[PDB]
Every structure is written in structure tokens, then in C-alpha cells.
Amino acid sequence: DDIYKAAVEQLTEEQKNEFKAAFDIFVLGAEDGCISTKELGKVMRMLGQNPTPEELQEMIDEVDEDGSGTVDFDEFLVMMVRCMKDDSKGKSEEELSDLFRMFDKNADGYIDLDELKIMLQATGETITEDDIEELMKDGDKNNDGRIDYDEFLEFMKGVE
Amino acid sequence: DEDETTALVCDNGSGLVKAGFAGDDAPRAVFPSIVGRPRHQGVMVGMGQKDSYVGDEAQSKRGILTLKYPIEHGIITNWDDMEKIWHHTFYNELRVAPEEHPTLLTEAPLNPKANREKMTQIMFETFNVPAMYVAIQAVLSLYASGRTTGIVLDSGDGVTHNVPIYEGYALPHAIMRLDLAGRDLTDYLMKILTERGYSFVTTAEREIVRDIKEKLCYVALDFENEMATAASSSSLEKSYELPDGQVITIGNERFRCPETLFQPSFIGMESAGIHETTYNSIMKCDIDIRKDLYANNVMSGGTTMYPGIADRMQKEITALAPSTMKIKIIAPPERKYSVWIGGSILASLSTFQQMWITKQEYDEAGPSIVHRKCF
Amino acid sequence: ISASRKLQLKTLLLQIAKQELEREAEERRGEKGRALSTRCQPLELAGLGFAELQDLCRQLHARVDKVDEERYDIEAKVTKNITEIADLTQKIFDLRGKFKRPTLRRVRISADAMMQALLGARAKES
Amino acid sequence: IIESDLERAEERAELSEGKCAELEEELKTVTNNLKSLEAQAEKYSQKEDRYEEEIKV
Amino acid sequence: IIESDLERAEERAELSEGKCAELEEELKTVTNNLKSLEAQAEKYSQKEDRYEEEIKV
Amino acid sequence: GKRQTEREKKKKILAERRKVLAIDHLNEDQLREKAKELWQSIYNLEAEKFDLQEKFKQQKYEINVLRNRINDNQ
Ligand SMILES: Nc1ncnc2c1ncn2[C@@H]1O[C@H](COP(=O)(O)OP(=O)(O)O)[C@@H](O)[C@H]1O
Ligand SMILES: [Ca+2]
Ligand SMILES: [Ca+2]
Ligand SMILES: [Ca+2]
Ligand SMILES: [Mg+2]
């Protein structure tokens, strides 16, 4: 969703207008005003490829932000921009160890919230408290107050 | 993890290695003495390239790894397994280096000189250890027993040692070792179970039946009478449930397995049973102290965890010796770890801290001179 | 907040991470230079005689052997450490595997071909 | 949802069965030890009675 | 089918829990009797040793 | 017995790098430049050693890190 929404916001206005037009084309005559498994499969047939039902479910689950089981415009942009794989080309294991070490400056084996916050402060961008909390949750899985190396590895999916 | 500069007590007993820091009452790292070796060659990618498993890592996988015993009858067969088990105990469980604290090892009585020189050399040259010391198991067991008189019977896995100590006096001339123990009992149970009908010829099953013996097998109070009453079995035969699920049914064989100790003729050896050998050892001692040896006999070794050994010993000794005196046999609780426990209480004395052997004197003297210094 | 902001923060983290790594590399180079200057000091050949140069060369050879001995000990330590690191890393991989095998969905059809096939001539910016 | 519930119930049953087997092995060992102690105590009792009689004699 | 499997797993878990609890009560009872018998045997052995000392004297 | 030979090989590996030096066929001036090449060898050696040291430190952190992982997924 991270790279997806980033690419979405990177779209231009004319592109988003074409996306809205294509959405109206896909939901043309629909009954829920959104693209569900039925409408997505209909579009896939209209194209040529055939999609597995479980695959259609898993895809709609990888684009929704609401919880409707259907694809709306806000999710149409994600479903129409996810093509480029932004989170590919994972950094080398040595580079990952370097990342963990420099995030664990005091040499302890854990990236406490203080290190993450000072890092966000150092980056220079205006860090919002909500951003801090969301990143802290994304890293620290068990919510013990620190990001270990396994939780840090988990922090690298959707990141590049 | 450790804030006290004290020797690491590592009892490398045959069948079970028991390692722990001095001052503790029980070993923390207890694992069998086995080395599992990758049998086949895999084209798979990603698995550990480690070419030598050890301890619980080998116990968890006994179907793929061919199992080799690092000790046989007492004589060390392979030294690579020795280096493996110490390096593992040092850098996988204890999480401490030997370069910061001494190490009080325990060796079996009447062992080869090559074994002692080899272990000492691996502990001085290869590993940087400030000081080493070899100790006999019987003395430490008598320490843990809390006495100074008696004959210690240490039955390990492949060797059995009878060591008489009266009024705190070792008798190096009377110590007689006999290679009858848990492995020959496992072999006897295996061949008699093959006679029963369930035939196996692999080591993993051998370890499984060894565990089954440790759990169920006991000593009989009257062999022939139990044979007669078990001919028509009812409660005498038990149905055990294998950890895999196969329903095994074992009857009299249990209390006939350790009986091989009392009748070595079953394995076609002219050696005498453990009780008769101990009795002969008592005659080899002087008469004056024989009564005290009768009244203070102590037992050691994991093999003594079977129920019914004390009573069998009492009846056999009473049948062999006169029945006029008093012959009480004492077995301290948790005798198996007692040896190790002794090590702990032996490493806390300052005098013992003065009886260690540092690197420099050993290097100039050489290993053989070190053998003379100890004894 | 949005997810794009989090991605921007993460990429900024990565670049500030790389700059930090470069700074640490430069500091390590400087520390190596200083340690070299402290340990191995230059020679003083001005005023040495024939036999004196011979004795100096013998002493330099002895120092050569002493340093190689130290380096060999440190290299044996480094090899033991490499072995231990490999063992521990593989054990951790075996532990953490379980059910965490990922993939990038293949039904995500490339936008360029999809955009052409849906629009025709209208697709110019995408 | 039902598969998660099944997995949790299965793990619970496995843990319970393991603990139960450990308790059973302990029970057998303790029962054999108690039987041995009762037999030996009876022998000591009869022996002490015999020795009291011998003291009187 | 998975619901049937969940029901079976729950039944087995209940059975194992009940058996483990019964075994825990039995273990407590047997340990109580065990320590009582150990005390009795120690007393018997002490009295026998006293009688032996008297016999020798 | 092979382990004793292993320790002997450790000393033998230190022994192999050292070779006999000849100061009889050299003159006054050449010896000086030759002393300098010995000196550079020294320099070189310590450098690699230093590297190892730094790597050792790094490697130790790795170990620590690794330990934490087994203490978080057990
Ligand atoms: N809990 C146990 N119950 C029965 N037998 C055991 C037990 N533990 C070990 N043994 C037996 O003891 C032998 C190993 O004894 P060992 O560990 O050498 O004793 P020690 O450490 O006192 O020298 C093996 O043959 C094994 O079958
Ligand atoms: Ca939706
Ligand atoms: Ca930290
Ligand atoms: Ca955490
Ligand atoms: Mg023993």
C-alpha cells in the first residue's frame, strides 16, 4: 500500500482523469458502483487473460484501503499503478547489517524509539507524530519499545 | 553470565556430558555423548554446511546422521569428537570462553596415558586455558556422599569401576575396571528382543531401546522365581507405547536385562559379575577394614538409576559374606549428579586454587612430567 | 497521514544512512592512518654503518615475524568468528522461515500495455 | 476463523498430552520408589523387633 | 470438515486436561504418602541402629 | 595425532614466511634501500592486521545481533 499510494500521488491530474474515465467504463452498468471480483474478471476477459477467483480475492485484498471487497477510484489508482515493482532489489545482507548497526548507534542489539526519532529528526523532513507512531508500529512488532533485527528485517518490505 | 572467576566443572562421563559452573548443585548443560555425521551428500542449497553435529542437535536427528560413540570402554577412539564436544560446550551453551576461568575435568580411573596427554595438550596448546587439572571420579563422588570410608561402584555406560577408599585413603592397586555397563546391557536387550520377534539393526533404535530400558527396566529380587511366575504372566508383562506409536509388549525381559551384570556368561566372558568382583576386591583389601567397607559401600553412575539394585546387592552380599555382622548399603539421592556436585564443592577451596597447573610449567616440563606431578 | 509520506521518510532514511556509512568509512580510514603512523614509525638510516645496517635489517626481520604472528592469531580468531556467524545465521534462517516466503503478484499487468489496450490514442502521459 | 480456532485447540491438546505423559512417567517412578521404601521399612521393622527380643535374651 | 476436526480437537483437549488434572491429584496424594513413609522408615532404621549398638555392648 | 601435527603446522605456517637473509654480497648504499623494503613489509602487515581488528569488532556486533534474533523468535 505504501509504494502503491506513493505511485498514486505521483500520478498527474490528466492521468487521474483518464483513470476515473476507465473506472466509469469498468463500473458501467454495475450494481455496487465499484469493481468487485465479478467486474474485475469481466474486465480481464474483455482484455484476454483469465484470473483465478482466489487470485482475484487476494488482489482486491492487496489494493483496498476501506474494507469493501471491491475496488473504488481511490483503489482504482492503486490497481492501475502497482505495475512497477518499487520494493524490489533488496539490499545486500551486509548493507542490511550496516543499516541495523547505524540505527543501533549505542551498540545494544535494539533500535529503541529514541534512535528512530533522532533519525527522523536528522533526516530534515517535517516529521509528524502520526508518522512516528506508524513507523514505530511497522518496525516494533511485539510492541516492547524497540525494533530488534528480525523486526527491522520486517521493516524492509515495501521499502527501497 | 558469570561474575566469579571459578573453574568450569565439565564431567565428560561416558554416555552423558554434564557441564556447569562451579558452585551449582546440578549440571545445566546435560546432553548425551554422541556425534552425528552427515551420511549422504545433498544437492540442496541453503542448509547449514556444518559437517559435524553434536549433542541435542544430533539427538533431534538420528535418522539422517550416522551415530558414532566418542568413547568406548574408556579408551578415546576419535579426538575430533573430543574437540567438537568441548568447542560446542564452550561456544554454544555456556557462552563463555575458557581464557577467563580454570576448568576442573573428571576422568575415569585407570585410563590410558595417551588419553590424558592428548586431552591436556588440546586444553593447553589449541585452547588458551590458564590452568587444567585431571581428577578421578571416585574421590569426588565420595566427597559428594559426605563421608571418607567405603567402596565406590561407578557404573557408567561402557565401563564399571570399583574403587575402595577407607578413612580417606585411595588404593590404586585394588582399582579394577571391567567394561560391562549400559552398552552391553543394551546389546543383550536388543538381541533378546530380536529373539522375541521385533528385529532392528540400526543405532537410532538402539538409543530408543536404551531410553526404554532407562525408563522401565529394573532389577529382579529373585531371578528364577520371577521366571517361573512370569511363565504365566498377567501383571508381570507390560505393554509400552513407543514414542512413534508402535505398541511394544515387554514382559520378563526387563528384569533379565541387567541380570547379565550378575552373569557375564551370557556374553561369553570369563569375567565375574559385578557383585562377585566387588566381593573379590574386598578380600584383596585388609581384614581390619573389610567390615567398614561392608558398612560404607557407595554407588555412582547413571546405570544405578534402576529400581531394585540396593536390595539385590544386599541379598547377594549376604549370601556370599557371613550373616553375623551388619552390612548396610547406602545410596545417596541423585547419586548420578553427585560426582559433578563434588566438583563444584572442590573448585571453591583456596587450597585447590593453589593446586592447579599453569601453562608455562607444563610447556617447559612437557606432558609426561605433568603425569608424574599428578601421580 | 498517508502512506506516500512514510515512503518519503523511509527513502530519506536510506540516503541519510548511506551518508552516515560514508562518514564512518572515512573515520575508519583516518583511524587506520593514525594507528599506522603510531605503530610503524619510519626508519633512521642516516649515519648507520655497514654492520649497523645488517643488525637493523635483522631486527626488522624479527619485527616482521612478530607482526605476522600477531596477524595470524587475529586471522584465526576472524575465521572462528566467520564460522560462528555462518552457523548462527543459518540457525536463525531455519527458525524464522516457517511461513514467510513472499512473491510479487504476476497478475499485475504492466500499465504501458494495459494503457495502450484500454485507451488507444488517449493514453499519452501514462 | 475456524482454521485458526482448530490450530489453537490442537496446540492446546498437544501441550496437555505432553504434560500428561510427563506426569505419568513421574507417577510410575514415584510409585516404584514408594513400593521399595515400604518393603524396606517393613524389613527394618521386623529386624528391630527381632533385635529387641535378642536384647532381652 | 474443518469444523468437525475442530470439534474432535476440542474433545481431545478436554479429555487430556481432565486426565492431567486427575494425575496431578494422584501425584500429590502419592507424594504425601511417600514423605510419610520416608519418615517412618527413618525412625525404624534409627531404632534398629540403637538396638544394634545395645546388642554389641 | 593429526591434531598435534595441526599445531605443528600452525608454527610451520609462521615458519614458511620467514626466509634466510644475506648481508654479505650487499654494499653500504644498497643495504639502506633494502632496509626500506623490509620496513614497507612491516607497514603492510600491520595494515591487514588493523583491518582484521576492525572486522573483528564488527563481527562481534554481528554475533550480538544474531543472539538477539534467537532470543526473539524462540
Ligand atoms: N535416568 C537414568 N535412568 C537409567 N539409566 C541411566 C539414566 N541416566 C543414565 N543412565 C545410564 O548410565 C550410563 C551413563 O552413566 P554416566 O552418565 O557415565 O554416569 P556418571 O555421569 O555418574 O559417570 C548409560 O549407560 C545410561 O544407560
Ligand atoms: Ca474498496
Ligand atoms: Ca540502540
Ligand atoms: Ca520489538
Ligand atoms: Mg558413572
Side-chain angles (χ1 to χ4, degrees):
Chain A
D1 195 330
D2 181 71
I3 58 178
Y4 301 142
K5 258 289 175 178
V8 164
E9 296 186 5
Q10 288 170 11
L11 296 168
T12 65
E13 187 177 0
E14 188 290 350
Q15 289 169 194
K16 290 193 293 182
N17 296 125
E18 295 177 5
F19 289 139
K20 183 62 175 62
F23 169 79
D24 299 329
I25 289 165
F26 293 1
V27 306
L28 186 67
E31 51 279 353
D32 55 359
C34 299
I35 304 168
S36 65
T37 59
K38 157 179 166 184
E39 267 69 21
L40 185 56
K42 172 185 178 296
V43 160
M44 258 354 90
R45 279 181 286 278
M46 179 278 289
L47 289 170
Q49 62 271 17
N50 294 292
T52 294
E54 284 67 7
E55 176 51 37
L56 286 167
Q57 178 70 354
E58 182 63 13
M59 184 66 177
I60 295 178
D61 296 1
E62 287 175 359
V63 303
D64 276 22
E65 299 174 21
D66 66 0
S68 64
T70 68
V71 189
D72 78 333
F73 172 60
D74 300 330
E75 299 143 356
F76 204 47
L77 301 173
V78 169
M79 188 299 293
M80 292 232 19
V81 304
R82 82 294 186 270
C83 59
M84 69 292 293
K85 314 176 190 177
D86 300 331
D87 65 331
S88 297
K89 309 175 186 178
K91 295 174 176 297
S92 61
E93 184 121 342
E94 187 273 354
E95 186 174 1
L96 303 177
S97 177
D98 301 335
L99 295 174
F100 182 83
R101 181 176 61 266
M102 65 199 157
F103 273 71
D104 181 11
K105 292 189 175 300
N106 54 358
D108 64 24
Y110 302 100
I111 301 165
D112 59 357
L113 178 52
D114 186 4
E115 283 165 330
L116 186 67
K117 291 174 69 62
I118 61 180
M119 188 66 204
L120 286 163
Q121 268 123 55
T123 55
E125 181 61 17
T126 61
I127 317 302
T128 304
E129 185 68 4
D130 298 331
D131 297 327
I132 304 178
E133 297 292 353
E134 289 292 351
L135 297 173
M136 184 58 216
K137 297 157 189 172
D138 193 329
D140 187 0
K141 297 294 183 179
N142 54 18
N143 298 332
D144 59 359
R146 59 198 193 173
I147 313 176
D148 60 64
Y149 191 89
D150 299 330
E151 293 168 327
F152 190 63
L153 295 172
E154 295 293 353
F155 189 80
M156 259 78 83
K157 182 59 175 177
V159 194
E160 185 66 9
Chain B
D1 172 66
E2 175 64 45
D3 173 48
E4 187 40 56
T5 301
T6 189
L8 296 73
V9 182
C10 189
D11 185 4
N12 304 91
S14 56
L16 285 171
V17 180
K18 289 167 300 319
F21 295 156
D24 300 357
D25 310 356
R28 294 189 298 272
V30 179
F31 63 98
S33 308
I34 55 172
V35 175
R37 280 277 327 200
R39 197 188 13 174
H40 297 197
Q41 62 91 50
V43 186
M44 293 96 46
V45 185
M47 287 162 340
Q49 301 325 123
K50 68 184 293 294
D51 197 9
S52 180
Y53 296 78
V54 54
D56 64 327
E57 210 183 1
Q59 179 67 221
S60 300
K61 60 176 75 82
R62 295 180 291 179
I64 291 304
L65 309 179
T66 305
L67 199 76
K68 52 179 46 61
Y69 280 50
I71 181 172
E72 174 66 3
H73 286 353
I75 56 172
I76 307 299
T77 52
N78 189 334
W79 298 103
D80 294 333
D81 299 0
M82 295 300 111
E83 189 278 343
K84 273 314 151 181
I85 62 176
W86 286 274
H87 179 301
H88 179 75
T89 312
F90 295 149
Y91 306 97
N92 296 89
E93 283 67 28
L94 301 182
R95 306 285 183 221
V96 68
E99 320 184 0
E100 306 176 1
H101 314 298
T103 316
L104 181 61
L105 300 182
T106 57
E107 56 190 11
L110 190 63
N111 286 26
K113 272 171 66 69
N115 298 201
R116 303 163 182 171
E117 65 88 16
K118 233 21 207 39
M119 41 79 76
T120 48
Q121 180 170 354
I122 306 169
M123 291 295 102
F124 282 138
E125 291 74 349
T126 42
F127 302 99
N128 170 277
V129 181
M132 257 321 114
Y133 192 87
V134 299
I136 210 162
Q137 300 172 30
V139 59
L140 282 287
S141 55
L142 189 63
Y143 286 160
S145 300
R147 277 80 65 84
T148 56
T149 294
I151 173 166
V152 180
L153 196 140
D154 184 5
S155 60
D157 186 15
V159 65
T160 302
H161 310 279
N162 315 86
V163 181
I165 305 96
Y166 150 84
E167 280 284 277
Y169 245 85
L171 293 163
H173 67 109
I175 339 169
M176 172 244 344
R177 71 182 301 182
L178 61 81
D179 311 319
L180 276 55
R183 45 196 69 158
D184 285 331
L185 296 182
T186 304
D187 300 328
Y188 178 87
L189 63 80
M190 192 59 219
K191 68 176 180 178
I192 67 172
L193 167 69
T194 301
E195 184 67 355
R196 174 95 179 210
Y198 316 96
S199 304
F200 315 99
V201 73
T202 71
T203 312
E205 275 94 279
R206 205 199 161 241
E207 207 273 347
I208 293 171
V209 303
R210 193 196 64 141
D211 184 68
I212 293 168
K213 177 178 73 170
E214 292 178 358
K215 289 202 298 297
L216 305 178
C217 283
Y218 71 104
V219 178
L221 305 183
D222 181 319
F223 186 78
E224 65 289 5
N225 275 11
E226 289 191 13
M227 293 282 94
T229 199
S232 59
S233 302
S234 64
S235 74
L236 293 147
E237 69 185 359
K238 200 181 298 306
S239 178
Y240 177 78
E241 203 67 16
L242 184 59
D244 177 69
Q246 272 201 85
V247 161
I248 306 298
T249 309
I250 161 92
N252 58 327
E253 286 73 14
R254 293 190 305 169
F255 58 77
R256 94 190 296 180
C257 178
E259 183 64 13
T260 309
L261 295 175
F262 310 95
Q263 301 284 343
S265 301
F266 298 157
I267 313 290
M269 56 232 302
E270 302 190 21
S271 299
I274 59 178
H275 62 284
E276 170 188 0
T277 56
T278 317
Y279 187 80
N280 216 45
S281 301
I282 296 169
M283 289 74 75
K284 280 185 286 184
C285 294
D286 315 339
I287 295 88
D288 164 68
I289 64 175
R290 269 169 78 179
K291 66 160 176 294
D292 297 319
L293 277 295
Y294 290 142
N296 306 123
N297 48 10
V298 187
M299 284 59 77
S300 301
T303 303
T304 57
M305 293 331 98
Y306 308 140
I309 308 181
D311 188 5
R312 179 68 189 227
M313 294 298 102
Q314 293 188 169
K315 50 195 91 73
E316 272 176 353
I317 63 187
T318 307
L320 294 171
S323 303
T324 52
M325 65 283 295
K326 182 274 281 176
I327 305 167
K328 157 165 91 173
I329 197 168
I330 180 160
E334 191 61 31
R335 63 190 69 98
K336 173 171 60 173
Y337 299 150
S338 290
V339 182
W340 188 94
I341 296 174
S344 141
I345 75 165
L346 191 71
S348 300
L349 308 180
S350 312
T351 48
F352 196 77
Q353 292 157 8
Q354 291 161 355
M355 258 74 97
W356 292 96
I357 301 173
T358 47
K359 183 106 179 63
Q360 71 289 345
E361 73 186 279
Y362 154 84
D363 299 327
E364 300 164 0
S368 49
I369 300 293
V370 163
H371 196 225
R372 216 274 339 152
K373 276 167 287 195
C374 301
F375 46 95
Chain C
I1 56 165
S2 180
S4 65
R5 193 171 178 90
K6 294 190 291 181
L7 181 63
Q8 186 63 23
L9 295 184
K10 289 181 188 184
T11 182
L12 294 174
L13 295 172
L14 297 183
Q15 54 104 1
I16 304 270
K18 287 145 190 138
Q19 69 86 26
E20 202 267 347
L21 298 171
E22 288 137 30
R23 181 186 61 83
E24 182 178 2
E26 295 179 0
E27 292 179 359
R28 286 180 178 181
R29 292 186 185 89
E31 291 177 0
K32 183 179 180 180
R34 285 191 295 275
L36 293 171
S37 300
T38 65
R39 299 169 183 176
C40 192
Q41 304 289 357
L43 298 176
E44 299 180 359
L45 305 176
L48 297 181
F50 180 75
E52 294 184 6
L53 289 169
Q54 302 182 330
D55 304 330
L56 177 60
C57 288
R58 298 294 184 183
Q59 188 274 331
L60 289 173
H61 196 62
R63 179 58 180 177
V64 164
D65 307 331
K66 292 180 279 201
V67 183
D68 194 69
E69 173 149 35
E70 297 179 1
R71 187 187 63 84
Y72 180 73
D73 300 1
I74 301 298
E75 184 178 1
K77 293 185 178 181
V78 169
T79 57
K80 296 179 181 180
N81 203 341
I82 289 172
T83 302
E84 184 177 359
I85 287 169
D87 300 351
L88 302 173
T89 297
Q90 59 78 27
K91 171 58 178 181
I92 295 161
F93 177 89
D94 298 331
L95 286 173
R96 299 181 66 267
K98 292 187 176 61
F99 57 95
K100 294 185 177 181
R101 287 179 181 90
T103 187
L104 291 131
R105 242 358 269 180
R106 220 31 84 227
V107 307
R108 303 177 322 206
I109 298 303
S110 302
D112 188 59
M114 166 288 293
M115 262 277 125
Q116 291 237 338
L118 287 171
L119 275 62
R122 299 180 294 177
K124 293 290 175 239
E125 301 295 349
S126 181
Chain D
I1 295 174
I2 302 294
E3 183 177 2
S4 62
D5 299 359
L6 166 62
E7 291 179 6
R8 290 188 269 278
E10 187 175 356
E11 177 274 349
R12 188 198 316 169
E14 176 274 347
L15 176 65
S16 177
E17 210 177 10
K19 298 305 302 184
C20 183
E22 170 257 338
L23 288 182
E24 279 144 11
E25 64 87 20
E26 185 179 1
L27 285 163
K28 276 75 70 180
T29 302
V30 173
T31 301
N32 296 115
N33 177 265
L34 181 155
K35 173 180 174 182
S36 64
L37 291 169
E38 182 178 2
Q40 59 86 204
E42 177 274 348
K43 290 118 185 177
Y44 292 136
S45 180
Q46 64 178 12
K47 269 188 304 187
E48 73 184 2
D49 299 357
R50 293 182 183 174
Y51 295 160
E52 183 64 8
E53 185 177 3
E54 189 177 358
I55 287 289
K56 295 298 144 182
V57 174
Chain E
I1 297 163
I2 211 167
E3 289 177 359
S4 180
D5 299 0
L6 168 60
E7 194 180 3
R8 278 145 45 182
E10 290 178 3
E11 287 175 7
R12 198 188 75 159
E14 171 273 351
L15 176 65
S16 183
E17 188 279 341
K19 190 160 60 178
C20 181
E22 186 178 2
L23 291 177
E24 185 175 357
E25 270 66 8
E26 189 63 20
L27 182 61
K28 286 191 297 179
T29 303
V30 170
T31 316
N32 273 307
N33 177 270
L34 176 70
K35 56 172 163 177
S36 181
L37 185 62
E38 182 176 2
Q40 292 295 304
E42 182 65 11
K43 180 238 178 181
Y44 299 155
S45 63
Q46 182 58 221
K47 301 293 170 296
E48 178 174 352
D49 299 330
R50 293 182 183 174
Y51 294 159
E52 291 175 359
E53 186 65 18
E54 296 290 338
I55 289 169
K56 67 182 51 62
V57 173
Chain F
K2 60 196 150 296
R3 303 165 198 85
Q4 315 168 324
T5 83
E6 186 258 315
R7 183 268 181 189
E8 260 90 86
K9 298 180 183 181
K10 152 162 197 155
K11 285 313 154 186
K12 180 65 176 66
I13 291 166
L14 295 171
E16 78 182 274
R17 234 196 112 252
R18 62 133 175 130
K19 2 235 138 234
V20 238
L21 189 77
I23 57 171
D24 299 39
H25 62 87
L26 304 177
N27 62 20
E28 179 67 7
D29 121 88
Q30 191 287 334
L31 283 161
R32 285 151 191 142
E33 122 279 3
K34 182 266 290 177
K36 284 327 307 182
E37 65 89 25
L38 277 160
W39 177 80
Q40 65 96 39
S41 178
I42 300 174
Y43 192 92
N44 298 333
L45 297 173
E46 71 173 11
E48 291 96 9
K49 184 174 67 177
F50 184 94
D51 301 329
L52 301 172
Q53 296 181 353
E54 286 297 323
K55 265 183 306 289
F56 211 58
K57 290 187 290 183
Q58 183 61 222
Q59 286 154 306
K60 298 295 188 182
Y61 177 73
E62 301 293 353
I63 293 170
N64 299 331
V65 171
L66 300 169
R67 292 306 69 204
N68 299 61
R69 301 167 67 183
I70 297 176
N71 299 330
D72 300 329
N73 300 268
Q74 187 66 31

